[PDB]
């Protein structure tokens, strides 16, 4: 275990609010903004509006003409923003040599399920309409956002939309039931959750937690593009990625599950201090480029 992940796990354990104190949503949202990493000075950003949502084109240097990534941020379907993800998305854009469309999709509880999925699908549609070819496209996201990558793909497929060249969910939350064994077995190692149940409750607002667009681990994934699934060994969401990979394989989809030793939830986000975060970002990008060369 690198000295950085040890130092980071310690820092995160010190920061965390104790088991089952209830942090108000607006407090959680402000907290996340306030501690957001600043994107590198060479990331260029352009504000756009897409599907009635704020968005930024986020462009590292080296980006190729005609390529784009639809990026779906994490935050449990209740928090997160363009601002909280711009740093990490800039790096992914760097690694992939493609611009990213970073979407401020609708959040719960103000906009419950399925609003987020409507927004991702419509953004994908908007990309297609702008003239990006599906083979020049990828979709990626982290956490809630990683589940939403999959939900958008299934929904788009159902609506006759063509599939992109790849999708890359990062530590996806693909099952709203939160019944997976790893919530028990990986809980001590995972410094990043009745908290997550409140998030599901707020997003679902009474909807079936097994609805395929909420919980794509229960979805028919037949026809989906090649997948890279990144997940940390030390996270409560491990089984989400493992079962996602199973479902994908069974449904005929090319899937690559990478379980990173010692890593925590969306460890990519800590790329400034974590060499493994930088490495996993580079890997994300190489895979997008592999699939665009195919």
UniProtKB/TrEMBL annotation:
<protein>
    <submittedName>
        <fullName>Esterase/lipase</fullName>
    </submittedName>
</protein>
């Amino acid at each position: 275990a690198g000295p950085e992940i040890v130092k980071l796990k310690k820092i995160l354990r010190e920061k965390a609010v104790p088991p089952g104190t209830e942090v108000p949503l607006d407090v959680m949202r402000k907290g996340m903004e306030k501690v957001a990493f600043k994107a590198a000075d060479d990331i260029q950003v352009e504000q756009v509006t897409v599907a009635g949502c704020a968005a930024e084109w986020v462009r590292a240097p080296g980006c190729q003409a005609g390529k784009a990534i639809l990026y779906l941020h994490g935050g449990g379907y209740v928090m997160g923003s363009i601002n909280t993800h711009r740093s990490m998305v800039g790096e992914i854009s760097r690694a992939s040599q493609a611009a990213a469309l970073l979407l401020d999709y609708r959040l719960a509880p103000e906009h419950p399920f399925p609003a987020a999925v409507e927004d991702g699908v419509a953004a994908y549609r908007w990309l297609l309409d702008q003239g990006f070819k599906p083979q020049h496209l990828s979709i990626s996201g982290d956490s809630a956002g990683g589940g939403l990558v999959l939900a958008v793909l299934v929904s788009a497929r159902d609506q006759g939309l063509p599939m992109p060249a790849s999708a890359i969910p990062i530590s996806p939350w693909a099952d709203m039931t939160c019944t997976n064994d790893s919530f028990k077995t990986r809980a001590e190692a995972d410094p990043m959750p009745g908290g997550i149940n409140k998030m599901a409750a707020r997003y679902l607002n009474g909807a079936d937690a097994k609805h395929p667009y909420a919980s794509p681990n229960f979805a028919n994934l037949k026809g989906l593009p090649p997948l890279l699934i990144h997940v940390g060994r030390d996270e409560v969401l491990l089984d989400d990625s493992i079962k996602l990979d199973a479902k994908a394989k069974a449904d005929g989809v090319k899937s690559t599950l990478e379980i990173w030793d010692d890593m925590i939830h969306v460890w990519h986000a800590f790329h400034p201090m974590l060499p493994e975060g930088k490495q996993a970002i580079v890997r994300v990008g190489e895979f997008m480029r592999e699939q665009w060369a195919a």
